[PDB]
Design an enzyme around this catalytic site. Structure first.
Site, PDB file in Angstrom:
ATOM      1  N   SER A 384       0.810  -1.100  -0.097  1.00  0.00           N
ATOM      2  CA  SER A 384      -0.144  -0.051   0.082  1.00  0.00           C
ATOM      3  C   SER A 384       0.795   1.316  -0.122  1.00  0.00           C
ATOM      4  O   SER A 384       0.453   2.384  -0.174  1.00  0.00           O
ATOM      5  CB  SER A 384      -1.124  -0.136   1.109  1.00  0.00           C
TER       6      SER A 384
HETATM    7  C1  LIG Z   1      -2.351  -1.972   1.744  1.00  0.00           C
HETATM    8  O1  LIG Z   1      -1.290  -2.807   2.219  1.00  0.00           O
HETATM    9  C2  LIG Z   1      -3.631  -2.020   2.349  1.00  0.00           C
HETATM   10  N1  LIG Z   1      -4.220  -3.284   2.575  1.00  0.00           N
HETATM   11  C3  LIG Z   1      -4.381  -4.237   1.782  1.00  0.00           C
HETATM   12  O2  LIG Z   1      -3.392  -4.488   0.726  1.00  0.00           O
HETATM   13  C4  LIG Z   1      -5.057  -5.422   2.061  1.00  0.00           C
HETATM   14  C5  LIG Z   1      -4.541  -6.105   3.438  1.00  0.00           C
HETATM   15  C6  LIG Z   1      -3.692  -7.095   3.277  1.00  0.00           C
HETATM   16  C7  LIG Z   1      -3.176  -7.898   4.515  1.00  0.00           C
HETATM   17  C8  LIG Z   1      -3.778  -7.472   5.865  1.00  0.00           C
HETATM   18  C9  LIG Z   1      -4.621  -6.364   5.891  1.00  0.00           C
HETATM   19  C10 LIG Z   1      -4.975  -5.504   4.521  1.00  0.00           C
HETATM   20  C11 LIG Z   1      -3.470  -1.105   3.678  1.00  0.00           C
HETATM   21  N2  LIG Z   1      -2.212  -0.964   4.036  1.00  0.00           N
HETATM   22  C12 LIG Z   1      -2.019  -1.538   5.378  1.00  0.00           C
HETATM   23  C13 LIG Z   1      -0.774  -0.876   6.092  1.00  0.00           C
HETATM   24  O3  LIG Z   1      -0.801   0.407   5.798  1.00  0.00           O
HETATM   25  O4  LIG Z   1       0.048  -1.234   6.859  1.00  0.00           O
HETATM   26  C14 LIG Z   1      -3.385  -1.760   6.174  1.00  0.00           C
HETATM   27  C15 LIG Z   1      -3.377  -3.214   7.084  1.00  0.00           C
HETATM   28  C16 LIG Z   1      -3.413  -0.634   6.973  1.00  0.00           C
HETATM   29  S1  LIG Z   1      -4.404  -2.057   4.777  1.00  0.00           S
END
Ligand SMILES: *C(=O)[C@@H](NC(=O)Cc1ccccc1)[C@@H]1N[C@@H](C(=O)O)C(C)(C)S1
Length: 640
Positions: A384
């Protein structure tokens, strides 16, 4: 002239046999031993070349300017110039003379000792004396030692003073208790196939302090390669190993007694660090009467290499990982100075280059977390964190209005019913989401929608302005970052996934620190550099300064807002802009998912430092944001 052409082929095929290392096949091309024909028999020529050329490690014999004329009825004189490579460098501008004999259709070579070296007249001998070169050091940006040849202390045993019999196993157990060593290895080292009664059998190199020595224990001061930080920089620096006989056959300039870089920077800069071997190659008379000197030059020590690394930052960045799988990259983003390149888990480079046991080296490769891997040079899905790039692209082409508010209901969303059961997923159920809110809560549905709206054409147009596919000018072996496998997603689903850092994206942490450097230079990408003196390369106008001054203030809220995904860093009380990420990978080793935690962070006031940390295959409720408190405090204090 019908036979002179066949004679020029005999000289060419003879040099080939010498150059190919097969001295026997070369001797089979000489005439019979006589006074007018060859000066030695075939087996004597074999031992003459093998003994002389082998002593100087002669390889790569190339000739030029061949001239084959005639002399008598069956005698054709031949001549050529030659050059060859030895243990002391290249031997150029050599003049060779001789004669051939075509007693029949076959033309042989009247061999002569002047065909080993130009002026070897008869029973002349060859001597070689070499002075070994000292390996240069690797140092950080402040002169601290990262890889040096230091004075070590080695704990060994002599089986004659250990004891008679019962007192020998007692001293073997007394030595095992005063040095933290397996007592079964004390009897396994003194019982190896190479041990004699009065021999000194080394056990392990003592780190620092020397405890009390029991019956039959001694310390030998030995010199060798030494790495102060050890595991903290093991993947970056590397280790050196004993040079083998097969190594000299590849590059004879190596010292058969010296060490050679095996991985990391020790291997990348092996030439600049090992120096050049010094000595003298000379032809002599019957005794050590030095006739003509062929090659001679003084020894040159190895050049030292100064890195952009900060030893204090490298050690803290590594220790913050607590031995779990991960990596950390810290740069001064305005210049690209790689302050720290940590990878974890790691191996001990001092126990690796001084004396590793046959079992401990098996544990390093049998380790599933693979400590040998330089994770700062391994491609990953950026997660992300990549929304920053997606947004900055969406602001340059105007697809994204910073104040337009998408209305999202629920935690799952799909474009059409043509996606089947697949849906982009977000964690927070916020109804009204604009740009600032999506970066705070890290909203995948927002990023996925704005990517599909942007279109693949306008998306890659902004992505290509970065470093996807380029090879960075760094002495670190890595693959170039990729957008997808092919030049087109050809899938609305894959296009959406690439919007929030999944899909077929592959970017290593060093390349990530390069792409994310635009937010510290107003949309100008600053290429990272590891060598301290290299000039700073950059790439202007990657993203517009409009998007930088829009996202960077939003990235502060990722830390400051109470619902921000990095609010645990508010405790630092330093100016911070950050963006977290947690990508998921499909592990074939187990049906349970493996997820990597990412963290990007830099100082948005002075742009003095930039950080990219990751945790590969993270444990539950573990994250890179949790461990960055310490490194961020140091980088904020020492790099404004
Ligand atoms: C990016 O990583 C976002 N979420 C996803 O890609 C889905 C996901 C995958 C595994 C666990 C939870 C959600 C968002 N970015 C993260 C981060 O910033 O660490 C979040 C968990 C906040 S969702």
């Amino acid at each position: 002239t019908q036979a002179v052409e066949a004679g020029e082929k005999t000289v060419e095929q003879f040099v080939q046999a010498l150059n190919k290392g097969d001295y026997n096949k070369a001797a089979e091309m000489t005439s019979k031993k006589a006074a007018n024909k060859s000066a030695l028999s075939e087996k004597e020529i074999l031992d003459k070349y093998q003994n002389i050329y082998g002593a100087a490690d002669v390889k790569g014999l190339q000739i030029s300017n061949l001239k084959v004329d005639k002399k008598d009825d069956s005698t054709y004189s031949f001549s050529y110039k030659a050059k060859m490579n030895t243990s002391l460098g290249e031997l150029k501008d050599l003049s060779y003379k001789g004669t051939l004999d075509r007693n029949d259709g076959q033309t042989t070579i009247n061999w002569q000792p002047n065909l080993v070296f130009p002026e070897m007249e008869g029973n002349d001998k060859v001597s070689l004396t070499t002075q070994e070169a000292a390996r240069g050091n690797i140092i950080d940006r402040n002169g601290e030692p990262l890889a040096t040849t230091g004075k070590l202390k080695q704990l060994g045993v002599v089986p004659s003073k250990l004891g008679d019999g019962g007192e020998k196993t007692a001293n073997i157990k007394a030595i095992a208790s005063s040095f933290d060593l397996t007592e079964d290895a004390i009897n396994q080292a003194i019982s190896q196939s190479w041990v004699q009664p009065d021999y000194f059998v080394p056990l392990k190199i003592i780190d620092g302090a020397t405890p009390e020595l029991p019956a039959g224990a001694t310390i030998q001061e030995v010199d060798g390669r030494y790495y102060p930080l050890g595991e903290a920089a093991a993947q970056l620096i590397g280790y050196v190993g004993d040079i083998t006989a097969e190594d000299i056959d590849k590059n004879p300039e190596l010292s058969s007694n010296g060490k050679i870089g095996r991985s990391g920077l020790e291997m990348a800069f092996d030439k600049d660090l090992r120096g050049t071997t010094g000595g003298k190659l000379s032809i002599t008379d019957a005794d050590g009467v030095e006739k003509k000197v062929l090659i001679e030059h003084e020894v040159q020590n190895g050049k030292d290499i100064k890195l952009t690394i900060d030893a204090k930052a490298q050690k803290t960045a590594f220790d913050s990982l607590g031995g779990k799988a991960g990596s950390t990259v810290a740069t001064t983003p305005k210049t690209g100075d790689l302050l720290a390149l940590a990878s974890s888990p790691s191996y001990d480079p001092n126990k690796m280059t001084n004396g590793i046991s046959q079992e401990d080296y098996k544990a390093y490769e049998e380790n599933p977390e693979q400590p040998f891997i330089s994770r700062f040079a391994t491609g990953y899905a950026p997660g992300s964190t990549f929304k920053m790039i997606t947004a900055a692209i969406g602001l340059d082409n105007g697809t994204i209005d910073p104040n337009e508010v998408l209305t999202i209901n629920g935690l799952k969303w799909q474009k059409d019913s043509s996606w089947g059961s697949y849906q982009v997923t977000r964690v927070s159920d916020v109804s009204q989401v604009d740009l600032k809110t999506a970066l705070i809560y890290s909203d995948n549905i927002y990023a996925a929608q704005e990517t599909l709206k942007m279109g693949e054409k306008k998306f890659r147009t902004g992505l290509d302005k970065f470093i996807f596919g380029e090879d960075l000018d760094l002495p670190i072996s890595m693959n170039p970052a990729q957008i997808s496998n092919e030049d087109s997603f050809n899938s609305d689903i894959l296009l959406a996934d690439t919007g929030y850092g999944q899909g077929e994206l592959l970017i290593n942490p060093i390349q990530q620190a390069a792409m994310y450097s635009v937010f510290a230079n107003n949309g100008t990408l600053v290429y990272p550099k590891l060598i301290a003196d290299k000039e700073t390369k950059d790439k202007k106008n990657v993203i517009g300064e409009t998007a930088v001054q829009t996202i960077v203030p939003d990235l502060r809220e990722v830390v400051q807002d109470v619902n921000g995904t990095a609010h645990s860093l508010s405790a630092l009380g330093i100016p911070l802009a950050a963006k977290t990420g947690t990508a998921e990978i499909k592990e074939k080793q187990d049906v349970k998912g493996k997820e990597n935690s990412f963290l990007f962070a830099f100082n948005p006031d002075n742009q003095g430092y930039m950080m990219v940390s990751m945790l590969e295959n993270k444990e539950d409720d573990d994250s890179a944001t949790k461990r960055a408190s310490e490194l961020l405090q140091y980088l904020n204090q020492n790099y404004q």
